[PDB]
Amino acid sequence: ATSNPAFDPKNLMQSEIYHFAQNNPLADFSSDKNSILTLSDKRSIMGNQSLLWKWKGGSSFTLHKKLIVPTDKEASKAWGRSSTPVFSFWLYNEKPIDGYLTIDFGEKLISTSQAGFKVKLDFTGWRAVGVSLNNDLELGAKVDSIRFKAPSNVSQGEIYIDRIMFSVDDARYQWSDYQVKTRLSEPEIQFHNVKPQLPVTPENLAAIDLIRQRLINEFVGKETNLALEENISKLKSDFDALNIHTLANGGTQGRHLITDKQIIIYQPENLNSQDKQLFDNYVILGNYTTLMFNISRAYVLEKDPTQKAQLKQMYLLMTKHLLDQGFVKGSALVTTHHWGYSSRWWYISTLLMSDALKEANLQTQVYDSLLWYSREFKSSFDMKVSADSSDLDYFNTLSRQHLALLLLEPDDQKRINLVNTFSHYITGALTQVPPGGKDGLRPDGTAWRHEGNYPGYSFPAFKNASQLIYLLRDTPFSVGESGWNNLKKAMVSAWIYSNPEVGLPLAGRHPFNSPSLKSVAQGYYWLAMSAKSSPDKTLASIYLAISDKTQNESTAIFGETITPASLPQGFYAFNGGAFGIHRWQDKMVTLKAYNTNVWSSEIYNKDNRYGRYQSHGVAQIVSNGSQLSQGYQQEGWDWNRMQGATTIHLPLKDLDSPKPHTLMQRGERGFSGTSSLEGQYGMMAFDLIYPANLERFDPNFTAKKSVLAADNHLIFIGSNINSSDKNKNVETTLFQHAITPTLNTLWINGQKIENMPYQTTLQQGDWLIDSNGNGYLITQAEKVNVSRQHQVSAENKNRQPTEGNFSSAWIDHSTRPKDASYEYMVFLDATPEKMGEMAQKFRENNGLYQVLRKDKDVHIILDKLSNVTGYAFYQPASIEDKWIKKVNKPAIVMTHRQKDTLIVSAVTPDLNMTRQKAATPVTINVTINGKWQSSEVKYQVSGDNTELTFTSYFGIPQEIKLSPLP
Template sequence: MNFFKVLVFINVLFGFQAFGQLQPDVCEQRIPHNWNVINGKLSMSSQHFKKGKQSVKWDWMGSDGVISIKDSAFESVQNDPRSTFVFWLYNGEKTDDKLHFIFYKGEKEMYRFDFNLNYTGWRTAWVMYHRDMTKLADDGIDRMEIKAPQSVKKGTLYFDQVIYYVNINPRSPMRDLQVPFVNLEGEKAANAHWNSLYKFNANPGYLPLAREISDKNTKQFSQITNRYLKLIGAKKTTIALDSLRKEYDFWNIRRTKGYVTGRMIYSTNDIELTSRDLLAKAKAANEKSNIKRYAQLMLSVAHLHKQTDDQRVKQETEKLYIDLLDHMEGQGWSYGSGMGALHHLGYNLADYYSSCLIMKDIIKQNGRLERTFKTMYWFSGLGRTLETPEQLPVSNIDVFNTLLGSMLSTALILDDGTEKLRYMQHFSKWMSHNVRPNLEITGAFKPDGAVFHHGTLYPAYGTGGYNGLAPIIYVLSQTAFQIDSDAHQQFKDNMLMMHYYTNPTRWPISISGRHPTGNWRIPDMPYAYMALSGTPDGKEKIDKHMAAVYLLINKNEKNPYVRRFKNMGIAPAVYPAMHWTLNFGLLDIHRRNDWLLTIKGHNRYIVSHESYPNANVFGRYASYGQLEVLYPENGETLASHFRDKGWDWNRIPGTTTLHVPLDVLRADIKNVDDYSGVEEMLLTDELFAGGVHLDKQGVFAMKLKGHDKYKMGNFKATKSWFTFDSLVVALGSDISNPTMEYPTETTLFQNYLGDKRESIYVNDTKINSFPYKNEEGIHTVLDNRKIGYYIPGNPQTVVYKENQTSRDQKDLKDTNGDFTGLYIRHGHAPKNQGYEYAMLIDTDSKKLADFASQMNSQHALYTVLRKDSVMHSVKYHPQHITGLSIFKSHVHLADKYILDNSRPCLVMYKDQQNQLDLAVVDPDLAFYEGDDDAPRNADGTRREASIYSRYWFKTPSKPTVIKMTIKGGWKKTDTENNQHQVEQTKEGNTMLTIQCKYGLTTKLRLTKK
């Protein structure tokens, strides 16, 4: 994709609609003909400019100095709720007064706002007419006036890039010291971690200022700084001075009569304001990442200055760096400036903070340390750490990923003293608070180990969080500023959970978010840093558990950490045979031997998928029960079934779907409200989805329902999976929908064929032929990945090997590939259809045939006890374990032990002699109560709405209570366990009152009375 297309895509992606709306640069060639001045003078000037080489200079005389502007662009304002006024202003003399902007219809004032002049250099503002300005009337606009400050008799200002009207994303503008009234709600929005710099700056801090610092504090400041500088240095690349000179020349920085000019340094958000012509110029000038490019140059200069012993090179790099620092400040990258709008500034500005810390001595020698600290403080948002713990916003992966090191650099650049001590104490406490689990949909880390971003389990973002957090935890470790031991343990547990759902480096496609490529990997270095941080209790300087995980992920014998850990006698980690349920993420995890099995669902709290323009556009069914098996990555076995080469996005393994043409499946992606960008993240109105586990076995179930957006509001199915050792029993019932046009299917597998000659076995017959298709009498299938399928009864089942054509997940090109697959047909407009099948993982044709024979004997491994709208239940005979997905309450269950339940729930029990072990989960995370809250259309169908717009997005999950009647008389074994209470009923049965919370499994043991 060429650069122009990329920028067009970015505009679509973020909801930017600026193309075709902008007048040319009115401040570049000549004084605009429609600008008239009273008590002053307008002229063109090359002394200061933002874009281009000139700006409009305004010399005013007297407090009644005015610029009056009349333009047809104002006519578009009234009917556009997103209409915005934008300008850049250079101020050479700081004053505590304001510039006044007033918009008229004739002589009647319509809107107005003030702009503070308490700065020097360039500043900008993006002010939305209808939301941000003071609205005095609403009859349209035909002209505006800019009135001089009242307390200053005369002065000079420079205008550039004045845009009377542009339609922008309302989430973007941010308030700052010049326009503190802009986008006040932005500090509560999903992008508040970028947009709340004004709020962070105002935090006074809650810790007292110490009278003095100790020698220990000073020594640890040095230790922390040296550790962090070593981390920064480890990432450096050596760039020759000639190359740095050439890159420096690109910015055209000049010093004339005490002021600095040069090429404009713009932020990511400026793309919202850019016309097609300017986009083409940006492409030609290679300015696609302007501020990031500038910060990278600053870091490269800093690295060269630090590593060279040549005094001439040191002198030149010092000059280059100070020039770069001053130009950046003058351009508006300065304390108190919001640059109009800033998102993802952590990604783009990261190298700036590192360069400043490296060059601290040079910055101080040149008299710029205080100014630089304030700028770093502002843009890093270090002030967020000064908020009292009870008022802290929820944790955010973007902050961990992109701003953590920048915040630390800001604190460390201060000279040693009580102020530095206070910032470091705040930072440490803030870190501890933020790595602890939180209970909302928003936030990063959940009680079950899920790592969240965009309101869902999202390891692709989680890796960035780990990459940001782990090295900082290490840098602070074994000092007075280390994070609290419980926070350390909880963060370690979260990292271990990602380790458990990767095998050993890749995670399932179902949790890939908008990037279902199969190429994303778990990062190794965070595990090394956590190993170096020591154990959470502080007893060991090396955490051997985390070191073992690192050795599993990184097998490079030449790696220094690998050598170090192995020399300590640490061996690579071995995965435990275990079952985990991440009910915040609606992911079930089952591990045996060297393979990983996961199942993914969704409900009214957790979205089914995330699609952006050109990203996962066919991902509607990603969480319709996707079941994946991942083997280790080696040359003998295909680690994953997935390849985006001919992949049929309708036939995702484990899912029940409506099989539609790709043009129908393609997401219709919109900007549905002011809380979101251009994206699709759908929620069902079904509540039931989740899992439970007991004795390393598990059950996962969901009530599936489609979304009305795609006329699938009546597409329903009840699905469950019972995972016992290497056996999976999959059940479906109540499969119904009225759609006659397209068939409904349940996919058992769709596997990529690296070689079309790869064998499968159908009814114990080896199939090498290609293509191949069988639609009759299919009872057992062994796929090309050593997974066997047993299909009792006689459903309409299809097994095939064939070449498939499709589109890649970005919808950019046609794809083609060879696949084998197996699916069950439920027909067109099915009514109360169902299915049952079993999977044997890591098996062969003989074992599968033996299993099928055993299932037809008196020694079956499992028995399906019930499969209907009330309950799915299965007994696994070898372990005497029964799993139940109970979809209704107070309905006769006909179960051996459970007579009644007060809420839908998931239950497993193991009965042996006079003992009953139970595991119970309430799958309702209870973020809100009552019926589904989605907005409705006039016909009652659900309307698409952003998850960020839901009032419960930031409310905590609430505990619930399940009352369950157990047949017979039982008593508690663990009297200290307060998660459940036991009482006897007058019928001689036992009433259990079970405390449930956060989707976690509540386990209890009862003994017969």
């Protein structure tokens, strides 16, 4: 506390704190005749002393402090977010008081003299009080008096007060509690309950106790976001440093606990040097509860009975300190927003310490406390299934903590009702198709957070959701098979689109830091072993592959011999993110577009700044293993030249998102994505359309870009390429990778190139091989540049300069000012000798493929190596073709004429929804030439032709095997 008034314009944001750790500590204080003010060092919040206020009923004391109380607007302008001036203090009751403390604000007040508020005193322990001076009183610029009036209807009493504070606080976070009413309330959990109820039986009680044990097993036998500490010496050293002591007639003394979010009320960056030194003695709750958990784990594993006893007493003393500090039912502590970050490992510690809390008579208090602070999470914790229940962050950060809370419920029948309802809630959350872009699993196996397919969020959710199902397995609380089935689909999908990292195009806002299935490995075992007929051989075989375990190792893990999964082969369509995956030997190709329903990129204030082209019809080739080792190196990476994309090469200042904070740029139409045929062949259709009027986006930049993927190869074609500037700087990237001692070689037309720097220009009939063994045969292009060069770039978070040496090749479209085009072919198993053979086949009247149409309405590609035809209907159209005659919606159709059968697949990659609406099926009428007979696709001969009726739901392809009619 200074001589300056509260909210002094020298620094509005500099808190005035009465902590009493200064010279002449009661200077600013006066009492009426019926109050006595002391310093007591027996408990405190900040510094080592608090104010002991002895009083007769109706008596007052006064703080003499001038307040220049700012408007919310002024507070807000000073801080930079919505703010209010707050009055806050801590008080301790050794005994409950049946009445109210009145806090009054005025000018030159005495016991007998504007606005004020009430604090109910019917509690024991520390409580915090915090009110908006502008918004929570029942204030003119002359206020200099804060009067504390003991209740009138109570003959006498005693209250300890510390850390009386005037500060600027976030206007969201003065919360109402059992002591103080504010304008803000987080209402208490009201648990849903499912009928019929399971009875308390020995069986149902044993199952509850097995689920608790199984949770204990997971936490004592590595968790992300858990700072594990197994050295007892260290746990004891950290504990002693808390300086906790039991006091005589109840409570503790020790270092004050505060959450990472609660500190905001002090404005720590603006504290005077005196206060900050004291504030620096606080303990952050996250660290404290992590310690409580690490102690609980050691206690469980401890074989020495003396060390075990000590670890228990340390845990119970930390629990006692935590409760006495006011982390109890009905104590808001002004706010506990983002509660999970401070408490997740407290929840879990209570499972390990459940019998110790029972014996110490602490279970009910710790249950009431955790349930109270859990009210922040009411939307999930009430356990009523809703459109929002499939939240992937919940599955990651809260789902096990939720179960732990329910398992801590003291009544047996209520605990069974809660866990039964939880089983139903998780089954619904894992089964339902959330409407619009709401979080959760999808029917193509994508898994959405931030309104799109998002591996970075789904991967941790898969791990913990699998673990939950496994914790509940083979009990009356087991998750329904519908939830198990849907999660299997999402997890098998993730195995398909990862190798073992997701491609650049699936990296979300973290390009070059893709999530890895290696982080999800244990979820494959959990889900495998929690099958209705365990183990699921598919999931088990994936677990072994991803974890690098042998067939020999399988019998002990799964209880039967299982061959580790070989890498998946063929083509898989995932229109949930407007992508598809082509797999051949150890390579995966991520083909990715975007549309109205699929954002191109997530770009934040300090993430993915240069990500504009993340989804620009990219076709990133990844062999099994580290992408960095394959030359996907952030440093010096040309963000313009994402593999397979058609882009405008821009300076980074212009490629950078035009929003300083968040942009998730969606496309201009529903249609773009992939389709599949026979699980083996794929096609991408990408309609590249820019917004009419977004800064730095050329409104006339267009392309049509199709890819047909079969076996060891991909045929890439593009048409209708334009920009505002006659295709100046318009380019299609064949590849880009870093040059290293292991990635040092390019082949051009049978010549090894290792020089750095190197440039050349190629055209139709030329080929290359990159250092990753991909061959590129140029089949239509006037100018392809090849470069080995030093590149300067900037990193995607803070735009700081980077540099590196790269091999790349791109088509220069500036040679065709209007409706530029390209064609080229990739071989995934290229060698100089085989690329020589592919080039000869190309010169033999193009033995490789034929483009049957390439215009704004349709792209048609006959692959002569695979004998498959792909049809990208960018617009409904009648066409001339051997198989297909007409399609009445934008669609992707594929055909394969085997011996005596014609296989036809169709889809629209258009998911047919909005951010709000549920996806509904699109009916696609595909007319085919000739008379056919037979899958849920319907067919009807009509004249010399056959009408196929396809139902396209969430961009999920359908196919039908047709045989000819005489």
